[PDB]
Amino acid sequence: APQQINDIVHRTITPLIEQQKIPGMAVAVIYQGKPYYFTWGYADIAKKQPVTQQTLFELGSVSKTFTGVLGGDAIARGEIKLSDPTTKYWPELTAKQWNGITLLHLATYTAGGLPLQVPDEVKSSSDLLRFYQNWQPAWAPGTQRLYANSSIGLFGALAVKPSGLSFEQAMQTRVFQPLKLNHTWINVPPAEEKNYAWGYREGKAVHVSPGALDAEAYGVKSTIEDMARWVQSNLKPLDINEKTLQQGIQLAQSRYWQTGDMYQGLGWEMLDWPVNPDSIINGSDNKIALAARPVKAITPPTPAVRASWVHKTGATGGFGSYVAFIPEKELGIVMLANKNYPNPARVDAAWQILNALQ
């Protein structure tokens, strides 16, 4: 890789790893369209397995970007419409509070205060129906944004209903395969477990636990190579042959709502570039990212803006990930670590690297 990339990456990541005490980490920088990989530490401390370009990391909430694009693809296929009421795809949701709540609201966390997490006691499909039926919104739809797995999670499950395919089935055939993301999984197969890094929380090795709507909200595992390819695809969707998928990616980057300097897409979140580091770094801190914030509707949605800082942070009990890219500069980065460390530190490092390259 060019010495400039090598230097900025290493001089930025090495200190990060030491300060946050990250066991293992993989980084990919997309420069002028080409990917450059970097790896450090361990995927498995006990077995001394190093992090490689083939190591699988839990993406946590970065999984929402895949869900958003899969949803966008479904829209492009004409199977669903974001303006459709949630009840059109789940007739059993007869509770009056759902009148007025559309798939758009679910996909963008603006349904009226759906909870960040689906309760652990929710296992069965009837438990899930009950959960949504009994939920009482704190606000009218389309007025406030509250980041929630139970929101985009339901969107993902409903978006694939028409296709008749399971969520994982649809994701593999409509997104992973067409983009040649052959080492990205919702459920890691036995054959790939040798590459599945362990996450670490308080020194204990851990893997994400099964949960309702986990696949749709935080269940994707992937390699730094496939993630770099995911970034490349989102940087230049037009180079994608699959028509509906090309459209789907564009739809996930459209700006639907605005809160402060941030715009909400489908999974992806965007800010106008050039951005102000502290405007995104501090904004990343769960304090701001997870808070209840009034939203302004963008009517109609603004098509993907090339001059944007597009990103998504992600975490599970033992992993921390970050993806950010700037279409206009054909620049991007992916940071995967097997320790969930502070979001501000991730964005600060990412900024430091990308700003230096353009």
mmCIF file of N, CA and C in Angstrom, residues 13-62:
data_model
loop_
_atom_site.group_PDB
_atom_site.id
_atom_site.type_symbol
_atom_site.label_atom_id
_atom_site.label_comp_id
_atom_site.label_asym_id
_atom_site.label_seq_id
_atom_site.Cartn_x
_atom_site.Cartn_y
_atom_site.Cartn_z
ATOM 1 N N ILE A 13 -4.115 4.029 14.319
ATOM 2 C CA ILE A 13 -4.627 2.816 14.950
ATOM 3 C C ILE A 13 -3.787 2.229 16.082
ATOM 4 N N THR A 14 -2.464 2.250 15.942
ATOM 5 C CA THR A 14 -1.595 1.698 16.979
ATOM 6 C C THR A 14 -1.871 2.317 18.345
ATOM 7 N N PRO A 15 -1.963 3.654 18.412
ATOM 8 C CA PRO A 15 -2.235 4.334 19.682
ATOM 9 C C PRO A 15 -3.631 3.985 20.196
ATOM 10 N N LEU A 16 -4.581 3.870 19.274
ATOM 11 C CA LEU A 16 -5.959 3.535 19.622
ATOM 12 C C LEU A 16 -5.998 2.181 20.324
ATOM 13 N N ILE A 17 -5.355 1.192 19.717
ATOM 14 C CA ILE A 17 -5.312 -0.153 20.275
ATOM 15 C C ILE A 17 -4.730 -0.165 21.685
ATOM 16 N N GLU A 18 -3.682 0.626 21.909
ATOM 17 C CA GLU A 18 -3.056 0.685 23.224
ATOM 18 C C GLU A 18 -3.935 1.385 24.257
ATOM 19 N N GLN A 19 -4.516 2.517 23.881
ATOM 20 C CA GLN A 19 -5.364 3.271 24.796
ATOM 21 C C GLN A 19 -6.650 2.539 25.177
ATOM 22 N N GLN A 20 -7.268 1.875 24.205
ATOM 23 C CA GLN A 20 -8.515 1.167 24.454
ATOM 24 C C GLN A 20 -8.292 -0.292 24.835
ATOM 25 N N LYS A 21 -7.043 -0.744 24.765
ATOM 26 C CA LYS A 21 -6.709 -2.127 25.099
ATOM 27 C C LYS A 21 -7.533 -3.097 24.256
ATOM 28 N N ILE A 22 -7.491 -2.913 22.942
ATOM 29 C CA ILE A 22 -8.232 -3.762 22.009
ATOM 30 C C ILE A 22 -7.407 -5.018 21.712
ATOM 31 N N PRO A 23 -7.993 -6.210 21.915
ATOM 32 C CA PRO A 23 -7.292 -7.478 21.667
ATOM 33 C C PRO A 23 -6.899 -7.684 20.206
ATOM 34 N N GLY A 24 -7.836 -7.404 19.307
ATOM 35 C CA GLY A 24 -7.584 -7.583 17.893
ATOM 36 C C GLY A 24 -8.349 -6.585 17.054
ATOM 37 N N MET A 25 -7.800 -6.248 15.896
ATOM 38 C CA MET A 25 -8.457 -5.276 15.051
ATOM 39 C C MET A 25 -8.062 -5.400 13.585
ATOM 40 N N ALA A 26 -9.017 -5.108 12.712
ATOM 41 C CA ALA A 26 -8.791 -5.139 11.274
ATOM 42 C C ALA A 26 -9.315 -3.833 10.689
ATOM 43 N N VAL A 27 -8.552 -3.262 9.770
ATOM 44 C CA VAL A 27 -8.938 -2.014 9.134
ATOM 45 C C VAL A 27 -8.769 -2.105 7.623
ATOM 46 N N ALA A 28 -9.709 -1.510 6.901
ATOM 47 C CA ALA A 28 -9.648 -1.460 5.453
ATOM 48 C C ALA A 28 -9.872 -0.006 5.076
ATOM 49 N N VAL A 29 -9.031 0.505 4.189
ATOM 50 C CA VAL A 29 -9.186 1.864 3.715
ATOM 51 C C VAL A 29 -9.411 1.748 2.217
ATOM 52 N N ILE A 30 -10.467 2.384 1.727
ATOM 53 C CA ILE A 30 -10.751 2.379 0.304
ATOM 54 C C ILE A 30 -10.239 3.725 -0.182
ATOM 55 N N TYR A 31 -9.228 3.687 -1.041
ATOM 56 C CA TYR A 31 -8.624 4.903 -1.575
ATOM 57 C C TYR A 31 -8.724 4.876 -3.091
ATOM 58 N N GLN A 32 -9.378 5.886 -3.653
ATOM 59 C CA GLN A 32 -9.560 5.963 -5.095
ATOM 60 C C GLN A 32 -10.127 4.653 -5.632
ATOM 61 N N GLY A 33 -11.034 4.054 -4.865
ATOM 62 C CA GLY A 33 -11.660 2.812 -5.290
ATOM 63 C C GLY A 33 -11.002 1.504 -4.874
ATOM 64 N N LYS A 34 -9.700 1.531 -4.592
ATOM 65 C CA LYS A 34 -8.966 0.325 -4.203
ATOM 66 C C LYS A 34 -8.890 0.114 -2.696
ATOM 67 N N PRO A 35 -8.987 -1.149 -2.247
ATOM 68 C CA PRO A 35 -8.924 -1.459 -0.817
ATOM 69 C C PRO A 35 -7.517 -1.785 -0.327
ATOM 70 N N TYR A 36 -7.222 -1.360 0.896
ATOM 71 C CA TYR A 36 -5.941 -1.623 1.533
ATOM 72 C C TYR A 36 -6.248 -2.149 2.929
ATOM 73 N N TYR A 37 -5.707 -3.322 3.246
ATOM 74 C CA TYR A 37 -5.978 -3.956 4.530
ATOM 75 C C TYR A 37 -4.882 -3.887 5.573
ATOM 76 N N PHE A 38 -5.311 -3.875 6.830
ATOM 77 C CA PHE A 38 -4.410 -3.812 7.963
ATOM 78 C C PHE A 38 -4.984 -4.660 9.094
ATOM 79 N N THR A 39 -4.123 -5.400 9.786
ATOM 80 C CA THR A 39 -4.575 -6.233 10.893
ATOM 81 C C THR A 39 -3.621 -6.173 12.081
ATOM 82 N N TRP A 40 -4.176 -6.314 13.282
ATOM 83 C CA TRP A 40 -3.398 -6.280 14.517
ATOM 84 C C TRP A 40 -3.962 -7.233 15.555
ATOM 85 N N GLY A 41 -3.085 -7.728 16.415
ATOM 86 C CA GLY A 41 -3.522 -8.569 17.505
ATOM 87 C C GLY A 41 -4.183 -9.908 17.279
ATOM 88 N N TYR A 42 -5.022 -10.263 18.244
ATOM 89 C CA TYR A 42 -5.680 -11.558 18.278
ATOM 90 C C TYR A 42 -7.175 -11.672 18.102
ATOM 91 N N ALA A 43 -7.560 -12.691 17.336
ATOM 92 C CA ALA A 43 -8.953 -13.022 17.095
ATOM 93 C C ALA A 43 -9.371 -13.872 18.293
ATOM 94 N N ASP A 44 -8.424 -14.664 18.792
ATOM 95 C CA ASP A 44 -8.639 -15.546 19.942
ATOM 96 C C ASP A 44 -7.380 -15.523 20.802
ATOM 97 N N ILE A 45 -7.471 -14.882 21.963
ATOM 98 C CA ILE A 45 -6.334 -14.771 22.870
ATOM 99 C C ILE A 45 -5.863 -16.125 23.406
ATOM 100 N N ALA A 46 -6.804 -16.931 23.888
ATOM 101 C CA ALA A 46 -6.487 -18.245 24.438
ATOM 102 C C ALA A 46 -5.765 -19.163 23.454
ATOM 103 N N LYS A 47 -6.260 -19.234 22.223
ATOM 104 C CA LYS A 47 -5.654 -20.090 21.211
ATOM 105 C C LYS A 47 -4.606 -19.389 20.348
ATOM 106 N N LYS A 48 -4.262 -18.159 20.715
ATOM 107 C CA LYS A 48 -3.251 -17.383 19.993
ATOM 108 C C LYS A 48 -3.511 -17.251 18.496
ATOM 109 N N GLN A 49 -4.779 -17.183 18.105
ATOM 110 C CA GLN A 49 -5.108 -17.043 16.695
ATOM 111 C C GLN A 49 -5.063 -15.556 16.371
ATOM 112 N N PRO A 50 -4.244 -15.171 15.384
ATOM 113 C CA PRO A 50 -4.112 -13.771 14.985
ATOM 114 C C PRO A 50 -5.282 -13.301 14.141
ATOM 115 N N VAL A 51 -5.475 -11.992 14.092
ATOM 116 C CA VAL A 51 -6.522 -11.436 13.261
ATOM 117 C C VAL A 51 -5.946 -11.451 11.849
ATOM 118 N N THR A 52 -6.730 -11.920 10.885
ATOM 119 C CA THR A 52 -6.282 -11.950 9.496
ATOM 120 C C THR A 52 -7.377 -11.319 8.652
ATOM 121 N N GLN A 53 -7.153 -11.251 7.344
ATOM 122 C CA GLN A 53 -8.139 -10.679 6.445
ATOM 123 C C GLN A 53 -9.345 -11.614 6.317
ATOM 124 N N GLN A 54 -9.229 -12.814 6.890
ATOM 125 C CA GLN A 54 -10.296 -13.809 6.813
ATOM 126 C C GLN A 54 -11.048 -13.928 8.143
ATOM 127 N N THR A 55 -10.607 -13.185 9.152
ATOM 128 C CA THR A 55 -11.250 -13.236 10.461
ATOM 129 C C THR A 55 -12.656 -12.639 10.384
ATOM 130 N N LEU A 56 -13.621 -13.323 10.991
ATOM 131 C CA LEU A 56 -14.999 -12.845 11.021
ATOM 132 C C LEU A 56 -15.213 -12.090 12.322
ATOM 133 N N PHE A 57 -15.831 -10.916 12.218
ATOM 134 C CA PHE A 57 -16.140 -10.089 13.378
ATOM 135 C C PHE A 57 -17.646 -9.864 13.409
ATOM 136 N N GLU A 58 -18.199 -9.695 14.604
ATOM 137 C CA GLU A 58 -19.619 -9.402 14.731
ATOM 138 C C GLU A 58 -19.752 -7.918 14.368
ATOM 139 N N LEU A 59 -20.638 -7.601 13.428
ATOM 140 C CA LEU A 59 -20.819 -6.217 12.990
ATOM 141 C C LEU A 59 -21.752 -5.417 13.884
ATOM 142 N N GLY A 60 -22.525 -6.106 14.715
ATOM 143 C CA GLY A 60 -23.452 -5.394 15.574
ATOM 144 C C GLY A 60 -24.396 -4.566 14.715
ATOM 145 N N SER A 61 -24.685 -3.337 15.140
ATOM 146 C CA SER A 61 -25.606 -2.475 14.405
ATOM 147 C C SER A 61 -25.220 -2.088 12.973
ATOM 148 N N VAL A 62 -23.987 -2.357 12.564
ATOM 149 C CA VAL A 62 -23.623 -2.049 11.180
ATOM 150 C C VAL A 62 -24.470 -2.988 10.302
#
